[PDB]
């Protein structure tokens, strides 16, 4: 089987915590750079933070400082811890490759999972 599965979300107050997850499979996830992106209400999809295969990262601005990217090998699986949650974060999020987030941010193809809903409220 070839995907990626998003969980983890939920229903936070302000300032609160949640931890996603994705499990990849199909490939060797070890040596591809992989990233998280957001879906919010009325909005386009947007990159929010990336992970290479050297475990560099990035983060968009907007979240810098409150979420964090990490990946575990060996369990074909990405994290993306958000503390200090924020009403605008509120959206669904997706896994991708990062190869493929700018192409997602455009439209040009769509996520491959069907994400999991992160409220704040």
Not at 3 to 10: A, F, M, N, W
Not at 17 to 36: D, E, H, N, P
Not at 99 to 114: L, Y
């Amino acid at each position: 089987d070839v995907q990626l599965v998003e969980s983890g979300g939920g229903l936070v107050q302000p300032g609160g915590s949640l931890r996603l997850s994705c499990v990849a499979s199909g490939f060797t996830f070890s040596r591809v750079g992989m990233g998280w992106v957001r879906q919010a209400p009325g909005k386009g999809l947007e990159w929010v933070s990336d992970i290479n295969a050297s475990g560099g990262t990035g983060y968009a601005d907007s979240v810098k400082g409150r979420f964090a990217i990490s990946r575990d090998n060996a369990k074909n699986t990405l994290y993306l811890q958000m503390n200090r949650l924020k009403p605008e974060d509120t959206a669904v999020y997706y896994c991708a490759k990062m190869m493929d987030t700018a192409m997602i941010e455009a439209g040009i193809i769509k996520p491959a999972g069907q994400g999991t809903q992160v409220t704040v409220s």
